């Protein structure tokens, strides 16, 4: 085992900063490798493949190394390329296309090292492009394949064009013939900003082809990619040439899944750094390679934030560039990209904090500049990206003792209170309060911003002493209050509630009970949990009907209407205790009581949390059934090799079926609600002849888009019913556009 | 297979703290810790209400239950909490991203815990609060003030 880990340490150690020159390390390691080749053939093969698949940010470095070994051995090289091609085949069969891209890139840079003859690579690329000519195949395939080809170009384009420019030109003509007839319906659902200025958010393929065209016009003269093999001239030039076998991409299969299309996130510009190095242009291939390298570095060290920040700060390049802006832009692109970021958002905020720690002299200014820039473009940002921005900002400021120059944003005061900028400011203040106390928010926020600060989080007990005795149930409320101070049992409370004047459901009964209960347990979250759990059988008996569940939700909202966090946590606990099912918490968000608070964040956070709990419950029951089935099968085969369990399996099968049915019903109810509300709004606006684009409509439509983006993985199963019942042709085109975008997202 | 450098996760590793009142040997405690889903959140202020903890640790994923750190006799907060998540992955994410992140201008210390039974929310300290609160000597407004030893 010492041999294997010694080899791994040797191979990995190349690339890191060291006193000796890079060429010396490569030559020395190559010498050690040839010194140990006859006994460690397969070991070094495995290590090289693994490093070709898990270290794209050193893709050049190892490629150079692989040439030196080839210069020392021909059989080694041939077996290495055979291995790599078989690994690529496996990767394409595993539906893991990212490593497929990395492999292709490696092969192309290996072609640069005089290992594989150019014509074979030309044939491989021709097959890739010809994949676009396949019939009745998803466009996300054709897409990925063209993307792999074009992304491989920035590394071996000079060589292939200078060797086979004729076939290259034919291939480019085919690529244009394909790209001119692509479908762009998915772009609006994926753009962070819908505005075309000052930085259009163009699709990744279009931008990549623009970079390729610019590079071609520049005679394939890049200025950023590192090419260590240039110094290794003689050695490599006296190396034999291998030929890759004819490659045929695996045929399309129903179970195959391809990466969904994405949109490049562009928000900076060279004019933003009048002092630093000239930032690469938005259509320069250097900016694509830089973004790709940063993405790989973040994906290779996403576990240790310290190491990730250290790697990002020390990113090497052929020519000096404004690496601070690139890092900030790529991090924000990961955070904001739809449907979901590569990793958990808190990872990105902590990574930014660590990066500021490493480079306090320059990075904080860049972060502040990006913050202001995002604020100034809030008028069109997607609501999902807005939510991510609000969360990030709040947490990130909380870290630095809520110290922002709010006066610089006084503009929100002048414009409409419901406009995106003032709404964002109010939500940020509310979240900041959620991490602090109301007095803190007041003290920090300028006086002129006081109209935006969230309301004080105080309980509103309708049955207070000042409250008039005329309202029914005041005596019952006092009796319940005394009982609560007297540690009364459930039967006592039942007796107390029996003498309530009904105007199997008594809305006044539930109102008085819930009101009193909540009021008494209104000094901390934990007391509220204890009261709900202890007296959860009174809720369960009184809220048998879904109407009762809705009434309990409404009363709970009335009690805590100056504190959204309490709403969220209390409905989370009620749902967990099966006090109210998720459907009831779905029909309560679309109710007329919350119309004034429909666009607030807490409502959508509550909705998302309920969906998440429902999904986790379904997955947990499915996993339990899977474990039971596996145990039954193992016992059966072991006994054979020598009915109660079958009954339990059947029961769990029926339970999982019912859980899936309730999940489906939840999603269907949510979408039906959205459809009804948006249809009514559009009809009213059309009759009034007013502008259809208002902040409320944008918020609602982008929330529907957010639901689709978050839970496409499950809605893929409901696609049929969704298309048959909710999103039909008769529906208004505005609403149907979201469903069409969702369908095109993976087709 | 997979490079061992990438799989390194130094923020989700067991700490050097072993429970002193646990009913069993260290081995079963280690087994439980390797599969637990509960996080002990330390270095909190007495005044910190649980809504903000719920908000923050929900941001790191869904929360199943929260238990505030009550005093042994006064039944008031002592500056520690237990968060019981629904999945192991959420707890790991919270450790990698919530550990060290400020809260009320106070650094939050998150560590694995072997679960929660009755009697686990009252500080083992004979003064009622936390043992560290009885041994520390530095002033801290969020932690009441000088350590119990300083006053008496």
């Amino acid at each position: 085992n010492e041999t294997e880990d010694h080899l791994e340490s040797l191979i990995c150690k190349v690339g890191e900063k060291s006193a000796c020159s890079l060429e010396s390390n490569l030559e020395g390691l190559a010498g050690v490798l040839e010194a140990d080749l006859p006994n460690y053939k397969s070991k070094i093969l495995r290590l090289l493949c693994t490093v070709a698949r898990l270290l794209p940010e050193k893709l050049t470095i190892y490629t150079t190394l692989v040439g030196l070994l080839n210069a020392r051995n021909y059989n080694f090289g041939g077996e290495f390329v055979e291995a790599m091609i078989r690994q690529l085949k496996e990767s394409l069969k595993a539906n893991n296309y990212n490593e497929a891209v990395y492999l292709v890139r490696f092969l192309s840079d290996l072609v640069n090292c005089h290992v594989i003859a150019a014509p074979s690579m030309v044939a491989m690329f021709e097959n890739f492009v010809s994949v676009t000519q396949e019939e009745d195949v998803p466009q996300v395939r054709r897409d990925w394949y063209v993307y792999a080809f074009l992304s491989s170009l920035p590394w071996v384009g000079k060589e292939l064009y200078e060797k086979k420019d004729a076939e290259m030109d034919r291939i480019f003509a085919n690529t244009e013939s394909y790209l001119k007839r692509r479908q762009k319906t998915h772009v609006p659902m994926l753009q962070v900003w819908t505005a075309d200025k000052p930085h259009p958010q163009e699709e990744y393929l279009d931008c990549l082809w623009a970079q390729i065209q610019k590079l071609k016009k520049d005679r394939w003269q890049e200025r950023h990619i590192l090419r260590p093999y240039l110094a290794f001239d003689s050695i490599l030039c006296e190396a034999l040439q291998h030929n890759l076998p004819p490659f045929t991409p695996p045929p399309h299969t129903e179970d195959s899944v391809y990466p969904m299309p994405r949109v490049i996130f562009r928000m900076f510009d060279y004019t933003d750094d009048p002092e630093g190095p000239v930032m690469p242009g938005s259509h320069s291939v250097e900016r694509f390679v830089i973004e790709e390298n940063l993405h790989c570095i973040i994906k290779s060290h996403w576990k240790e934030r310290k190491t990730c920040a250290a790697q990002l700060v020390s990113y090497p390049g052929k020519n000096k560039i404004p690496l601070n802006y690139h890092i900030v832009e790529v991090i924000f692109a990961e955070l904001f990209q739809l449907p979901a970021p590569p990793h958990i958002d808190v990872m990105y905020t902590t990574l930014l904090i660590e990066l500021c720690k490493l480079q306090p002299g320059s990075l904080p200014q860049v972060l502040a500049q990006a913050t202001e820039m995002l604020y100034m473009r809030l008028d069109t940002m997607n609501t999902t990206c807005v939510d991510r921005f609000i969360n990030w900002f709040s947490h990130h400021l909380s870290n630095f003792q809520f110290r922002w120059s709010w006066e610089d944003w006084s503009d929100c005061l002048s414009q409409d209170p419901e406009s995106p900028k003032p709404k964002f400011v109010r939500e940020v203040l509310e979240k900041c309060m959620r991490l602090s106390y109301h007095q803190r928010i007041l003290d920090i926020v300028p006086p002129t911003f006081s109209a935006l600060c969230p309301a004080n989080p105080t309980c509103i007990y309708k049955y207070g002493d000042e409250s008039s005795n005329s309202l029914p149930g005041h005596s019952v409320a006092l009796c319940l209050a005394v009982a609560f101070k007297s540690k009364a049992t459930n039967d006592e409370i039942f007796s107390i509630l029996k003498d309530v004047p009904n105007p199997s459901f008594n809305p006044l009964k539930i109102e008085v009970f819930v009101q009193t209960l909540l009021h008494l347990a209104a000094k901390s979250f934990s007391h509220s949990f204890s009261a709900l759990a202890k007296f959860h059988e009174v809720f369960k008996t009184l809220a048998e009907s879904d109407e009762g569940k809705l009434h309990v939700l409404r009363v709970m909202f009335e009690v805590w209407r100056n504190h959204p966090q309490m709403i969220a946590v209390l409905v989370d606990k009620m749902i967990r205790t099966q006090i109210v099912d998720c459907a009831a918490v779905a029909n309560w968000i679309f109710s007329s009581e919350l119309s004034r608070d429909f666009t607030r964040l807490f409502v959508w956070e509550i909705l998302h949390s309920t969906i998440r709990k429902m999904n986790k419950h379904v997955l947990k029951i499915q996993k339990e059934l899977e474990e039971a089935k596996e145990k039954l099968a193992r016992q059966h085969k072991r006994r054979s090799d020598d009915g109660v369990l079958e009954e339990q399996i059947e029961r769990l099968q029926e339970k999982v079926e019912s859980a899936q049915s309730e999940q489906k019903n939840l999603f269907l109810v949510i979408f039906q609600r959205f459809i009804m509300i948006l249809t009514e709004h559009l009809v009213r606006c059309e009759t009034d002849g007013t502008s259809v684009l208002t902040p409320w409509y944008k918020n609602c439509i982008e929330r529907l888009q957010q639901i689709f983006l978050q839970h496409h993985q499950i809605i893929q199963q409901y696609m049929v019913t969704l298309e048959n019942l909710l999103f039909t042709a008769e529906l208004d085109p505005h609403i149907l556009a979201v469903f069409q975008q969702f369908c095109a997202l993976q087709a | 297979g997979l490079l061992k450098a990438l799989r390194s996760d130094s923020y989700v590793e067991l700490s050097q703290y072993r429970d002193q009142h646990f009913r069993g040997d260290n081995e079963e405690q280690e087994k439980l810790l390797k599969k637990s889903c509960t996080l002990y959140v330390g270095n909190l202020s007495f005044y910190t209400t649980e809504e903000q903890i719920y908000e923050l640790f929900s941001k790191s994923g869904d929360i199943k239950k929260i238990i505030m750190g009550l005093d042994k006799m006064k039944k008031t907060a002592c500056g520690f909490c237990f968060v019981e998540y629904y999945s192991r992955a959420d707890a790991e994410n919270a450790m990698r991203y919530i550990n060290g992140t400020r809260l009320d201008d106070r650094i939050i210390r998150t560590d694995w815990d072997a679960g929660f039974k009755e009697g686990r929310q009252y500080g083992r300290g004979r003064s009622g609060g936390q043992v560290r609160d009885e041994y520390r000597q530095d002033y801290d407004a969020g932690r009441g003030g000088y350590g119990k030893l300083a006053q008496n």
């Binding site: 106390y437 901390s524 759990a533 419950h617 | 505030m68 008031t76």
Partner: peptide
Amino acid sequence: GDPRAIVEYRDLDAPDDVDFF
């Protein structure tokens, strides 16, 4: 000066609580 009194969970009777859902 934290302008909020510490909460008192004195009788937060938590008997047996599980998540039925």
